[PDB]
Design an enzyme around this catalytic site. Sequence first.
Site, PDB file in Angstrom:
ATOM      1  CE1 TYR A  50      -2.571   3.436  -0.011  1.00  0.00           C
ATOM      2  CE2 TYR A  50      -3.567   2.414   2.429  1.00  0.00           C
ATOM      3  CZ  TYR A  50      -3.139   3.377   1.477  1.00  0.00           C
ATOM      4  OH  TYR A  50      -3.766   4.482   2.205  1.00  0.00           O
ATOM      5  CB  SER A  71      -6.076   1.610  -5.058  1.00  0.00           C
ATOM      6  OG  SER A  71      -6.108   2.857  -5.315  1.00  0.00           O
ATOM      7  CE1 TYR A  72       0.042   7.270  -2.595  1.00  0.00           C
ATOM      8  CE2 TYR A  72       2.044   5.718  -2.722  1.00  0.00           C
ATOM      9  CZ  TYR A  72       1.375   6.590  -2.830  1.00  0.00           C
ATOM     10  OH  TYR A  72       1.818   7.353  -2.800  1.00  0.00           O
ATOM     11  CG  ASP A 107     -11.896   1.574 -10.610  1.00  0.00           C
ATOM     12  OD1 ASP A 107     -11.593   2.315 -10.236  1.00  0.00           O
ATOM     13  OD2 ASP A 107     -10.674   0.503 -10.128  1.00  0.00           O
ATOM     14  CG  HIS A 149     -11.552   1.367  -7.305  1.00  0.00           C
ATOM     15  ND1 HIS A 149     -10.009   1.085  -7.861  1.00  0.00           N
ATOM     16  CD2 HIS A 149     -10.945   0.968  -5.672  1.00  0.00           C
ATOM     17  CE1 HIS A 149      -8.983   1.559  -7.090  1.00  0.00           C
ATOM     18  NE2 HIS A 149      -9.442   1.919  -5.945  1.00  0.00           N
TER      19      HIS A 149
END
Lengths: 730, 730
Positions: free
Chosen positions: A511, A594-595, A672, A704
């Site tokens: 993350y 994601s990140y 998304d 997403h």
Amino acid sequence: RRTYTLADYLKNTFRVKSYSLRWVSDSEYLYKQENNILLFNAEHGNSSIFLENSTFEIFGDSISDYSVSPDRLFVLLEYNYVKQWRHSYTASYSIYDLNKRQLITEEKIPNNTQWITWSQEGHKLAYVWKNDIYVKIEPHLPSHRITSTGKENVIFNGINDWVYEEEIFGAYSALWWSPNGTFLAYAQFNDTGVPLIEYSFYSDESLQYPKTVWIPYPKAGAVNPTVKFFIVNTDSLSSTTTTIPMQITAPASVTTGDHYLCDVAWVSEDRISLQWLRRIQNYSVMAICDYDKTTLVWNCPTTQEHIETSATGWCGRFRPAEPHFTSDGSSFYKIVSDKDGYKHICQFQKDRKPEQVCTFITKGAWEVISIEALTSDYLYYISNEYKEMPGGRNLYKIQLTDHTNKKCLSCDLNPERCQYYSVSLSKEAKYYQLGCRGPGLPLYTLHRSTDQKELRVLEDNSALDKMLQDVQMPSKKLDFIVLNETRFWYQMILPPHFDKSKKYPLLIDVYAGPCSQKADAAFRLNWATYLASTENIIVASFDGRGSGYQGDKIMHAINKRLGTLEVEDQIEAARQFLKMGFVDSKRVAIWGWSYGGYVTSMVLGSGSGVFKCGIAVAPVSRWEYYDSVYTERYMGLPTPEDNLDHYRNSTVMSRAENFKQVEYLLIHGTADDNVHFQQSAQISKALVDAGVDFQAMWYTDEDHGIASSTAHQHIYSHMSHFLQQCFSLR
Amino acid sequence: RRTYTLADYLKNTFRVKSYSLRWVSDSEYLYKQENNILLFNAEHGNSSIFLENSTFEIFGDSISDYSVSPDRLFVLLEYNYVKQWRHSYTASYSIYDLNKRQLITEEKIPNNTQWITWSQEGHKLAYVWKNDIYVKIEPHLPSHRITSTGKENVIFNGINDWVYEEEIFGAYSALWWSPNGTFLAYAQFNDTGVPLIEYSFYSDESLQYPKTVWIPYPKAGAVNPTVKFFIVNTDSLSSTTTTIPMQITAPASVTTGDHYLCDVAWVSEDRISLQWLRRIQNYSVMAICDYDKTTLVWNCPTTQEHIETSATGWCGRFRPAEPHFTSDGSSFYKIVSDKDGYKHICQFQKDRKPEQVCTFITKGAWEVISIEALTSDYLYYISNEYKEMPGGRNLYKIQLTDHTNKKCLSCDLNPERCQYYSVSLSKEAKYYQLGCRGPGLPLYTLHRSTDQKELRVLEDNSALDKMLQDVQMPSKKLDFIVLNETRFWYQMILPPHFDKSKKYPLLIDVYAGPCSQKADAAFRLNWATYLASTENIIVASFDGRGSGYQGDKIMHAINKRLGTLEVEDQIEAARQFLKMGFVDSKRVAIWGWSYGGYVTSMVLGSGSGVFKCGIAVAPVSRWEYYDSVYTERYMGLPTPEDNLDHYRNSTVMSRAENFKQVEYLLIHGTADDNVHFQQSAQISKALVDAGVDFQAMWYTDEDHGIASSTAHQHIYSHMSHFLQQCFSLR
Ligand SMILES: *[C@@H](N)[C@@H]1CC[C@H](C#C)N1C(=O)[C@@H](N)C1CCCC1
């Protein structure tokens, strides 16, 4: 001697219980038991039926949720729930009259409500429908339309537009009842100049032509929505066809250019607290406003202004912390960084004082996670102070009249089993329930605030415990390595009979976004559990620079330059892990969502040679594609007059070449609305132009979170096989 | 002892030459040589420069193409070519004056033309720009605007809308100069009620917000565009500000409901031939129209109507064949199915005759591929008659005055090297160039029509031949198996030193769409070549039911029910191949593109157990998603009143389950305007809901052909590795 199967994970074989209560007063609470809402007496287990197995079944099995009016006279019945974005969604409602014992049928509530809520007091209702705010002084009575400027994807009244819902407030709601329900404050957003993003939706195979969903979404540097704050007087409604809401106008030091509304908080009923933020989250102002009885207007005198500022990065963790006012609203406590950059609690006086607005009530190289309650004499909060573990969570309390009288209330209880607590105090902190998320199986207990006498145990996962006896569960080490002379915590999910002499494959779970934390003392049963208990893979996470709750020196380290240190430090952490011995350097991977997918991709594309393969799900490929509020908070504006260069440097595609030395798996959801797909599409294209082979996978119509049932299962199975192929297992 | 590498294929190591000439008269032709256009004298190699290495270089290296006016006085210079769909595209032009030796600079031609062309005679030009037709009587003179109703994605004047360009005409053009250039006929399309399909385009990673491309595209059963036919008199232009085009209205037996314009053909200069088709291609009418000098109008008397019909399926191979009129336009020859269902040549008289409109000039269980030229005494055509090989192509010729005087002109020449000929006769069939695509390396020769004296050899791939000496090239068997008592041709690309006793893995190369042909005698250097020459894989194709040029009994076998017999027969063919011995039944695959990808997917999802893996590129997953003209031609309308059931039965998603027993690879292009992606997206989703793992791959911004350089290479390498992994090689 059974292992934890991927099926155990996907089918949720081992259920982990909890105890989600709903304080109804300073001494009673509600609890769902076998589809029955029961009223419990904190003190003596004394229980009682509040709503039956019954009631709920009338509206079929579509009863999404329920909400009891504060005066416990009526109950809202949510059903026909339809998701939309992270928190947004639309349901249908029915008011059930407890007293009359039946469903109010008269003046019903629109079969497509976007938001609804009781007042803090009686049975007043405020709900948004078709982007307009409506009010019902009482359940049987008719709706009073408050606004009419409402319009889809343009004017939002009482609900947030996409970016506000996602990045500023965290919920769909933009309504705020004052105590004693006289006023109703609300925000209004104009999405007019905000650009649109338009992805396709395929739906059932019967739809011959795919739909198109458009959303006013502001990417970095783009034109943002605008705000306006109103407070309408609820009491006049009965004597007018229309009421004229009064508007509060953000403080001058914010109105010069783009800016946002940070947070709303009612102090008393003639005083409200608003927090504003500049587009460049360098600056923040929290005005306190008073209601003028004479001229019937709200005033926000600059004397009660209060300014928050950061010379290292941005304000707050993800935004300024919320204020907690005293009864007489004369003072308030709020979490802010101290002279050393440690988020701590300090007192403020309604009126600002020249560079002395604060008086810290907390000091130390640890931080206050959050304020939980403010009594007339006590301030209950939560920190990661105990045992110098920034990854741990404990409930503390300070006597206002004596800041020395500071005592931890969860530190003893179960040092072995619990190190991560969640709390929940009664209306007036007479009792408090504790949620042990700690190392061991989650443990819920309720106590009496006075002496902390643990009245009883609400839930110990004895059941889940008996179950896990016949399974070879993995362990979890939570320690810290030290780099450049600083503590840096990490954690490892070690496969069953883990032998420090043998060598296992390593999976870095990533993350590493600003103010993130992957290394903590919380118990979990996830994919990493299966990966260790059955594939003998070590799954480790590392909180490096620009992270967690360990002071701004560490957090702001990334400021104005994402895709830098947090990425590097992630590689370093791997190095260090290898030096620990038990890691087969020939089989080291890394994945992220994601990140995390961005960092994963940025690591794989660094050519450090340290990783074999990796998986990135719904990654961000370059910050110009992500939204404004989030991106800009750390990156500023993508302009030559600001930080355009760091924007263009932190690109994943700019590292396409280095992917030749890695097995890569890119996964993305078709619908998304958060991380647009345009992102992954730009990556695949980059690698294709570089002549780098890789593996891809799109998920038709998935969010997403690719969280529909069938999709969730499919994506994890597919990722498992990818690792299996990569690690020569399967 | 070198093999044919995947690089040999991808980098085009071994160039295969040809001889593309441009007959300028009955005795001379043009030929590009080292970026020089040369005029050649068919008879004596007598050559001569026509345009230099020069000229072309002025307009940079962006000179896309060139077009010499028929009176050899001017040359069109195409440049700034920008593709759009299969045949559509827009360039910029410059007229080069051969005589004056320089570029005409005065009345230039719009820097964004959609289409342009000389008259059949002098130097008249007609070009479409902004959807409107313009005319220039001569190069130095000004443009005369013919239409103005033009409008993007709505009104098309002189060019075809998407579906017409793709499914009816095959080109962007919808203009037709009459001989002697007096008139200019054109079609006009109204796309008004036609629905839109709207895919996303990402472009350079610098574009912050992806674009959206919309296209009026009619899927099966949807509302189609409408037509109108005009003929404007070119000669009046100089004496008016505007001319009024005259309209021809399709024949009554077609105007009752939806219908299409099939083909246009100018008979003489006062007579034109139009072919019309009903939406349900069951019926077709070819009217002949005459120009009335008196009332200045065109007449299409029902007496010259002519009706084509099919009680087995549809008209023509992909549409009614084109007519070939005599000089005096009194009669015409056209390819139509005979009493036995064999496409043959027969005579017609301008005026229709009661159920005797035709007199066949050809008989036999073979078909005429196409009519190549019609002399005052001879009719040159091409058939697959010779050696009963439907997969072969030979040039024949019949004396009109004596249908007995039928002689093959290519059958002898090189029975070993050539069995697949392409032709090209001079303006008046005095000479004819032959293109040997036949079994061996392609051979081009030109002859003198009189006695067939091969004047010379224009191109024998001696160069490519010397090159292929040092490479272990694979062979190609073209035979036939017999099922249910019928010949069914197939072909196999056998790896080098192919030993009938050993066992190899099999790859079925599929298409198998209506009237398709994969088994032929044409020489090729493709991916299959690499697959055999270096992976020792046998790549075979099989023309089963609903295919090729072997009569309607075989072709119409699929009618009203695609995704049936053609799929099955493909499996049977595999069975049969296995029975031939040399096939490792444990490693049999199958792949396909477009239609082929559908069959591949339908085979993999049949659970026949016969195939291990497969690859489908830009497949069709259910006919409602594909366009009207194509789909309906074989499937009718997707309505309960017609063929809705077969539509819903031939779905790929309805077979998701059976994919559990197969390694599947689905590939699709992001900007596929033909086979929408919605198609593959609907498949992936189907399999995901079925809990079937598979591999996917999207190609950002790629066409329906995924043919950009980098993409083309990437997709084949990726497919190679897929097979390698599947066949335990790599
Ligand atoms: C994926 N989680 C994306 C990537 C960038 C940003 C982060 C982190 N992000 C978000 O969804 C954010 N809205 C995030 C959710 C929780 C805090 C902010």
